Amino acid sequence: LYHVGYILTSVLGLFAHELFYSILLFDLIYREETLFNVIKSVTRNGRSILLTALLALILVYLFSIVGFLFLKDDFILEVDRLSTERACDTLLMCIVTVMNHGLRNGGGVGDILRKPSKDESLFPARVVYDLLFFFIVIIIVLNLIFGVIIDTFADLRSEKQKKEEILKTTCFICGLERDKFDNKTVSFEEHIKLEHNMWNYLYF
Amino acid sequence: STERACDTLLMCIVTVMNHGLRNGGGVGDILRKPSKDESLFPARVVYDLLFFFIVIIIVLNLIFGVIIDTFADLRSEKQKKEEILKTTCFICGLERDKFDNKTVSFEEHIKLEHNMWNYLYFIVLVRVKNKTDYTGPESYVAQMIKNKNLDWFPRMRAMSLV
Amino acid sequence: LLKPDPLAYYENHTSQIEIVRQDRSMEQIVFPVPGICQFLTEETKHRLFTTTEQDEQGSKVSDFFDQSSFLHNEMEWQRKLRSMPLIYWFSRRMTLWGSISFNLAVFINIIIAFFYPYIRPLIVALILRSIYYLGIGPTLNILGALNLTNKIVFVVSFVGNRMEFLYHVGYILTSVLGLFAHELFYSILLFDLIYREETLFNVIKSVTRNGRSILLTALLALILVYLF
Amino acid sequence: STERACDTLLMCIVTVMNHGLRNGGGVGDILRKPSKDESLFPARVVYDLLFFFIVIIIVLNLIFGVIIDTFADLRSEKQKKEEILKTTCFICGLERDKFDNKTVSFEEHIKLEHNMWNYLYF
Ligand SMILES: Nc1ncnc2c1ncn2[C@@H]1O[C@H](COP(=O)(O)OP(=O)(O)OP(=O)(O)O)[C@@H](O)[C@H]1O
Ligand SMILES: Nc1ncnc2c1ncn2[C@@H]1O[C@H](COP(=O)(O)OP(=O)(O)OP(=O)(O)O)[C@@H](O)[C@H]1O
Numbered sequence: 001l002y003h004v005g006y007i008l009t010s011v012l013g014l015f016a017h018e019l020f021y022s023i024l025l026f027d028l029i030y031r032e033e034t035l036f037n038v039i040k041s042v043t044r045n046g047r048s049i050l051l052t053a054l055l056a057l058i059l060v061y062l063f064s065i066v067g068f069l070f071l072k073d074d075f076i077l078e079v080d081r082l083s084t085e086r087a088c089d090t091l092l093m094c095i096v097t098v099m100n101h102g103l104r105n106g107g108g109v110g111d112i113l114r115k116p117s118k119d120e121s122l123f124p125a126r127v128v129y130d131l132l133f134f135f136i137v138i139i140i141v142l143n144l145i146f147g148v149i150i151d152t153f154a155d156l157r158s159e160k161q162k163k164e165e166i167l168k169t170t171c172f173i174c175g176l177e178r179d180k181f182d183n184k185t186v187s188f189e190e191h192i193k194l195e196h197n198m199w200n201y202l203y204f
Numbered sequence: 205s206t207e208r209a210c211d212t213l214l215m216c217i218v219t220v221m222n223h224g225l226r227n228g229g230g231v232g233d234i235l236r237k238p239s240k241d242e243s244l245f246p247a248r249v250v251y252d253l254l255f256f257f258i259v260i261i262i263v264l265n266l267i268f269g270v271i272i273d274t275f276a277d278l279r280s281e282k283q284k285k286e287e288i289l290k291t292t293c294f295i296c297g298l299e300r301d302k303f304d305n306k307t308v309s310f311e312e313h314i315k316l317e318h319n320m321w322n323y324l325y326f327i328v329l330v331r332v333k334n335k336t337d338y339t340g341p342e343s344y345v346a347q348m349i350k351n352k353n354l355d356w357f358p359r360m361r362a363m364s365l366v
Numbered sequence: 367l368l369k370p371d372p373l374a375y376y377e378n379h380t381s382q383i384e385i386v387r388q389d390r391s392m393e394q395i396v397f398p399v400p401g402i403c404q405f406l407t408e409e410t411k412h413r414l415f416t417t418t419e420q421d422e423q424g425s426k427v428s429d430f431f432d433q434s435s436f437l438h439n440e441m442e443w444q445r446k447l448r449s450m451p452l453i454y455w456f457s458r459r460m461t462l463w464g465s466i467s468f469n470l471a472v473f474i475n476i477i478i479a480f481f482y483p484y485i486r487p488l489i490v491a492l493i494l495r496s497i498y499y500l501g502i503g504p505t506l507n508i509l510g511a512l513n514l515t516n517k518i519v520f521v522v523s524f525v526g527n528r529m530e531f532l533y534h535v536g537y538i539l540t541s542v543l544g545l546f547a548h549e550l551f552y553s554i555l556l557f558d559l560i561y562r563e564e565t566l567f568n569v570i571k572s573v574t575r576n577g578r579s580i581l582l583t584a585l586l587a588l589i590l591v592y593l594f
Numbered sequence: 595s596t597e598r599a600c601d602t603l604l605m606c607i608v609t610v611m612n613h614g615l616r617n618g619g620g621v622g623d624i625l626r627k628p629s630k631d632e633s634l635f636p637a638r639v640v641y642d643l644l645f646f647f648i649v650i651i652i653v654l655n656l657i658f659g660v661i662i663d664t665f666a667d668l669r670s671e672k673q674k675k676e677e678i679l680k681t682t683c684f685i686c687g688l689e690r691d692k693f694d695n696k697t698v699s700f701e702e703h704i705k706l707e708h709n710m711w712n713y714l715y716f
């Protein structure tokens with residue numbers, strides 16, 4: 001199916017528009033096993049990553065609710081038209097702003113809100129809001145999305161080590177360890193080649 | 205005052221590779237800041253979020269997950285090597301466990317009987333002595349050394365265990 | 367009675383091994399250790415003990431036996447060398463040359479960084495006095511000359527103490543380039559902290575062991591950037 | 595209104611160590627933004643990308659991978675030590691599995707016979 005899709009993309013590029021040969025570069029993931037292993041680390045626990053993203057979206061939704069109810073006058077966004085607009089006139093806009101401009105920042109949504117003045121009555125509220133966003137949705141959740149990948153890497157490495165040592169140590173048919181064939185007339189390197197040759201069983 | 209990047213696909217690639225990867229939020233940080241009353245605003249939001257979530261959280265974090273995994277692999281393999289070196293015998297590959305309650309402890313099995321440097325000395329002796337004066341074992345080991353055989357070494361069996 | 371002094375001398379030159387006879391029975395061969403067995407350097411022993419790699423089975427002997435001949439050649443070379451007094455004196459002091467060369471490189475780089483718009487404390491004071499009296503340029507020239515001579519001595523010791531040699535000759539090339547071509551070429555000499563340190567080399571190994579993985583991930587990032 | 599850093603090599607080092615390491619995109623975020631028609635534009639692109647990819651994705655990530663690896667090493671060592679403490683006897687170093695189906699179990703072989711405090715008392 002992948003190869004016929006490749007043919008389809010090639011013919012589209014040849015006839016429809018030359019800007020379809022780009023997708024062909026996604027043969028590097030197929031021609032290579034190392035890159036495929038990295039993408040496997042990404043996409044083995046894919047449900048974990050997607051559910052963590054949904055958790056981040058839920059937290060963004062709650063923070064957007066709080067901002068819309070209380071801090072809706074601090075959601076002011078610079079714009080370049082063809083001077084400064086207001087984001088929070090509707091909870092959907094608050095969610096969009098806090099998900100686009102709040103996740104894509106090193107300090108959370110507090111980097112886009114109106115910069116407060118120390119002599120305001122909402123200053124402690126803004127400080128707590130920004131710090132909570134930064135500590136819950138940018139140091140933990142967006143870091144869980146990466147800790148999951150790291151843990152998946154470790155799991156793949158351990159699984160591959162187990163499989164390889166099983167293959168190179170124990171017999172394929174009888175599952176008999178290598179050490180059992182020490183100080184014996186037949187060595188394990190011979191037991192697997194003449195007696196328990198798994199291809200002789202297929203021939204039989 | 206200000207220039208346009210995308211007048212050619214090469215310039216778009218250069219801008220999105222230089223100013224896109226080198227940012228905490230992706231190419232959405234250099235692109236003209238849109239206005240909510242535009243017809244492309246959802247497209248820009250999706251574009252920026254996709255760039256951020258694919259090329260700056262999953263593809264610029266695999267270059268680091270790989271490093272962490274390599275660290276773990278190095279530690280594991282070094283630990284295996286150190287355990288093998290400090291527990292099993294170099295020549296016969298016999299664990300330290302088998303030399304408990306025996307007359308000779310493992311601390312002597314490696315220092316007196318199965319001293320690999322003694323085997324090196326024996327090899328040098330066998331290849332420095334004239335062939336006629338070889339005693340039985342010396343001529344035997346010379347014969348095997350000529351045959352490229354390695355059986356004369358002990359293998360999973362010391363002699364102090366029997 | 368045979369316990370230990372002639373007896374101590376004989377017990378110091380009498381090695382026993384446990385070769386396995388053809389009939390699956392073990393013997394205990396006791397033999398005098400040849401003379402050249404007193405020249406095997408301790409560093410070589412440590413290297414062969416640590417770096418030797420297990421083969422397909424749990425057997426490290428298949429490589430030790432292979433290295434036996436090279437060890438014998440080194441044994442003979444050490445016997446030959448110990449007669450030569452001057453080269454032997456150099457060879458005994460091999461870490462000293464490396465330390466001096468690295469310290470000179472670091473001091474040259476510090477002097478360049480701090481001045482270039484155009485017993486360690488005692489050595490620092492000496493360099494400061496040289497800077498005060500002669501000034502930068504001549505102080506730099508003499509420091510580079512000392513570095514080059516020390517690295518030549520280090521390389522002759524290295525060969526006499528026989529890819530790493532390629533690195534050392536590259537270091538020589540960089541030193542001479544800095545001394546003559548342009549004084550900003552000493553910057554590359556600071557890439558000896560990797561060679562002089564095992565920990566830094568271990569982290570760099572973590573980086574460059576799965577280098578193909580990192581490069582292919584970078585190419586994937588480039589493909590995604592191309593699509594965007 | 596704007597000062598120059600690179601009038602000397604020491605000032606360049608200070609600028610690229612203070613303003614380069616402390617940015618999410620390397621020193622390219624402080625350098626003058628170049629016009630596409632300049633002759634050195636490819637040079638600036640390569641310079642910035644190399645700084646970002648060598649000194650901010652690898653080295654400043656090695657400084658953290660080392661910490662992670664040390665965490666793993668500590669956890670493994672502590673698990674080993676705790677398991678040895680809770681399984682093998684302190685004095686004889688005899689596993690717990692050896693005292694199964696025996697007239698006396700490990701739970702008291704370490705409390706009556708091989709009590710190390712009894713050895714200290716002796
Ligand atoms: N039961 C087994 N356990 C482990 N390895 C096995 C087993 N059966 C076969 N093998 C391995 O699978 C491969 C099968 O080799 P095969 O019998 O086809 O011999 P061949 O084609 O002459 O090649 P070779 O030179 O590797 O022996 C060999 O690597 C053999 O060691
Ligand atoms: N088969 C072996 N298994 C384990 N360790 C070994 C083996 N052969 C040699 N060694 C170790 O390698 C080193 C070689 O010992 P060597 O004959 O050089 O002793 P030495 O120079 O007198 O020093 P020392 O006995 O104080 O370590 C020692 O550490 C010895 O324990």
Ligand SMILES: Nc1ncnc2c1ncn2[C@@H]1O[C@H](COP(=O)(O)OP(=O)(O)OP(=O)(O)O)[C@@H](O)[C@H]1O
Binds near residue numbers: 685704708710
């Ligand atoms: N050789 C050993 N192996 C394992 N655990 C040991 C060993 N020797 C002592 N211990 C443990 O150390 C502690 C020493 O117990 P101790 O003789 O002091 O009794 P205690 O202070 O009256 O306490 P308790 O009987 O309630 O455990 C106990 O936990 C004992 O299990």
Ligand SMILES: [Ca+2]
Binds near residue numbers: 336338
């Ligand atoms: Ca004879």
Ligand SMILES: [Zn+2]
Binds near residue numbers: 171173174176192196
């Ligand atoms: Zn079998």
Ligand SMILES: [Zn+2]
Binds near residue numbers: 293294295297298362
């Ligand atoms: Zn042994």
Ligand SMILES: [Zn+2]
Binds near residue numbers: 683684685708
């Ligand atoms: Zn006990």
